[PDB]
């Protein structure tokens, strides 16, 4: 889904698999905060949500615990209790159109 209608999915009771998160080289914008970037298997907070959108280009950097802008004024906003963080991807011909 797009940014204007951002979709969320709650992860139910299951054993968290975070080992392949850091060993994957496909992640190049894991500039994110919160808990320590090593003890992910030692934390099992009660509920976890994953929210997805397709914002473009350099607008991703405005996602921060407290920020304003054309994206972070009338769209997804980050509070000061945002435990967890953000993973970004890279665009290609998979999401593209010549026309």
């Amino acid at each position, epitope marked *: 889904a797009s940014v204007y209608a951002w979709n969320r999915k709650r992860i139910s009771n299951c054993v968290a698999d975070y080992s392949v998160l850091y060993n994957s080289a496909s992640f190049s914008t894991f500039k994110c905060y919160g808990v320590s970037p090593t003890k992910l298997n030692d934390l099992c907070f009660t509920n976890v949500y994953a929210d997805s959108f397709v914002i473009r280009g350099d607008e991703v950097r405005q996602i921060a615990p407290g920020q*304003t*802008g*054309k994206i972070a*004024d009338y769209n997804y906003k980050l509070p000061d209790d945002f435990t967890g963080c953000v993973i970004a991807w890279n665009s290609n011909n998979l999401d593209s159109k010549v026309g």
Partner: single-chain antibody
Amino acid sequence: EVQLLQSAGGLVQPGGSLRLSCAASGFTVSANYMSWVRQAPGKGLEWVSVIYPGGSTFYADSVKGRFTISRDNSKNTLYLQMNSLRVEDTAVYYCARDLSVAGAFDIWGQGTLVTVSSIVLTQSPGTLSLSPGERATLSCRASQSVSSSYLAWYQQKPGQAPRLLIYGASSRATGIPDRFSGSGSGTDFTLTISRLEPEDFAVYYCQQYGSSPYTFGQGTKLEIK
């Protein structure tokens, strides 16, 4: 009949304080964007600040912190405070509503002048002196190669306020007649004026938006051989 009035024609002592004023004539300032542009006579135009609905303000890269802009909905004003100012600050301080995506700077203010104590976007052609009776081509190049529709065109006037010609290089603004056309993509955008009229000889600028702080061209003048 929208009108944007300004009144700031006053001399400033070294390290003085001044308060500009921009008003509104029918549209509320609490639901539309406002922006300030420095004319910089003898050079192309620049950018100062942008305010969104809400009231978060973004400043230019050159000037940081010292500027203090504020909005007063009770009196419907767009106040801007100049604190202790340094050298090289004498220029015009136009204020205008910003709808860059749908119409770039459709209406402007009237202009002012504040004195002092005691993106790579370029316009290629230049003066290109010609005569009425044919067309002409104006080329604007950008180094970042913005994708589709993030460049607009402006027309100046001696002593008057800048005017909008085309927004997004695809469709002209309201009141713009069919003697102006625009095309081009990738790196360069071309503008053509057909059937030159006496009320067409004016400075033409190309400006970029939808990106990092806005930049205008150096300035292209129309002259008669």
